């Protein structure tokens, strides 16, 4: 169908495998998660923004900004909790609590603050243009994996893709992509058919390595702060 | 075994302007590679293949010999094979000395030292290799990436999910005679010279150059 509706889902847990409270850390005057909430809200194609959280501060920040809160069960906020299970829970919550029927879900990670409304807009346009079942934001690494080698038992090496691939121009080879975790745009119906992410009609939404920045440490956060400060003062 | 170093440096670039001649810790970028080739005992002569006046002036000034590269071989479309074949042809006409191996070195790898070149040539001799290429093991293994299919879709490169190496572009040590009979890089008896990710730094932007400057102070 030509006319489709989209819902944004932001998954942010309180706990972490590190000694960092990532999702609420200040970045250029606002909590980290705020950059992703605002990117979703700023996009014309997004009807509603939902934040799935178990945390009081994340929920408070989210509601304050105008996003809707999906109260996530304890089991789904553990270090062992599966990405699929959180999505299925959010799909279930939406089907029971939200009257609007959505074709696609735009899953967005709070750890990708350089992914903007413009990136979401473009990813949804690609999703529609290609008749995709799943659009994932990716980047082309500086050292492309299509030009890599694998080690043989005798200690020699051979091209992973082909024998001539490591010596060929990157432009003359199929492109190899690395997902950056910023955007996962998928058909809600196709996700709950296999109860997992679609395996077919998967298209890449290409972003630069610079815009692919993922927050894991205070250094990652410091680097992005400087980048935003540099764009501010020029 | 006698070895000739070939440094391929074109004037043009898709990104960073005058890349090969930009200052890095007191020396033009290319000078780090010229000096790393000259500092290695196994290297008899150092040649710089360029289409550029500035690169040639810097190279001659550092004592390297200049191979004047034709315009078509300095384009964005120009093949790696064609640049090497041209240098092989130039060497066979303009050089009385016969070399068994060619050590192809990129000026964009300034953290690759004489020590790294010595070790790659030692591996080349010890293994009786047809080809030795400097590599690194990336933090994100290439086997876990996606490959773009013909219809525009993506799927896992290797499978839907082994030791992987990524060439860093710093050193290519191969037999000249063997390269001439194949008109391509050897496909067998290829051994990896493993370097760290940190020493595998490649200059493409002013940020890459600034990062190397900082880890050079
Ligand atoms: N079961 C989980 C795991 C991570 N996440 C969130 O997904 C983002 C990226 O996860 P991450 O790689 O930083 O992992 P942790 O910080 O949770 O150790 C973070 O913003 C998490 O808050 C979640 O919502 N539910
Ligand atoms: N057709 C070409 C392309 C690159 N090169 C050189 O190969 C090195 C690395 O090239 P590169 O991958 O960064 O691409 P460009 O700088 O040419 O855009 C540089 O020192 C280039 O000057 C060359 O000699 N002939
Ligand atoms: Ca873009």
Residue numbers in the entry:
A (entry chain B): 0 to 233
B (entry chain A): 3 to 163, 173 to 228
What does the paper say about this structure?
The first step of the incorporation pathway involves the activation of sialic acid to a cytidine monophosphate diester form catalyzed by CMP-sialic acid synthetase (EC 2.7.7.43), a ubiquitous enzyme that is found in both prokaryotes and eukaryotes. The activated sialic acid is then incorporated into LOS or LPS by sialyltransferases. In this report, we present crystal structures of the apo form of the VcCMAS enzyme and of that complexed with cytidine diphos­phate (CDP) and Mg2+.
The orthorhombic crystals (space group P212121) of the CDP-bound enzyme contain four molecules in the asymmetric unit arranged as dimer of dimers (AB and CD). The final refined CDP-bound VcCMAS model contains protein residues 3–228 in subunits A and D, 0–233 in subunit B and 1–227 in subunit C plus three CDP molecules, one Mg2+ ion, one Ca2+ ion and one tetraethylene glycol (PG4), one triethylene glycol (PGE) and two ethylene glycol (EDO) molecules. The nucleotide-binding residues in subunit C and the bound CDP molecule (CDP 1) have well ordered electron density with low temperature factors and thus were used in structural analyses. Hydrogen-bond interactions between the conserved Arg71 guanidium Nη1 and Nη2 atoms and the N3 and O5 atoms of the cytosine base impart selectivity of the enzyme towards CTP. Several conserved residues in the P loop such as Arg12, Gly14, Ser15, Lys16 and Lys21 interact with the α- and β-phosphoryl groups of the nucleotide. c electron density indicative of a metal ion close to the α-phosphate of CDP and the putative Mg2+-binding residues Asp213 and Asp215 (analogous to Asp209 and Asp211 in NmCMAS) in protomer C. Along with the Mg2+ ion at this site, several water molecules interacting with the phosphoryl group of the nucleotide and the metal ion were also identified. Upon CDP binding, the VcCMAS structure shows conformational changes in the dimerization domain, which lead to partial closure of the active site and place the catalytic Arg169 near the Neu5Ac binding pocket.
